[PDB]
Amino acid sequence: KICKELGIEYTFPPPYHRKAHRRWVTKKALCTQVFREVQKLKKQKRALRAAAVAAHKQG
Amino acid sequence: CEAEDIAVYEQRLQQWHGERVRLIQREQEQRERARQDYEARRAAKASA
Secondary structure (H helix, E strand, C coil): CHHHHCCCCCCCCCCCCCCCCHHHHHHHHHHHHHHHHHHHHHHHHHHHHHHHHHHHHHC | CHHHHHHHHHHHHHHHHHHHHHHHHHHHHHHHHHHHHHHHHHHCCCCC
């Protein structure tokens, strides 16, 4: 109730307070982009596999 | 003894023909099944 009424929003503390510095911030950003690329490529490869095997099985 | 052999040897002679006939039948049935499955796999292709 209180959180709703006073508009306070309760956040849990993180584990690991560490200072995000230039190197770590950049590297992590990269690692995240890499990941998003890779799983997108696995998705495209499975689209190609499904299309190929389906168009084969039909005739 | 001849007259006794003539009776048997004849029935053998018909028997052998029965066997050959059955076996050619099996040859044909097999070949036709193989041709039907071959047409079924060649017309619609599914392999891994």
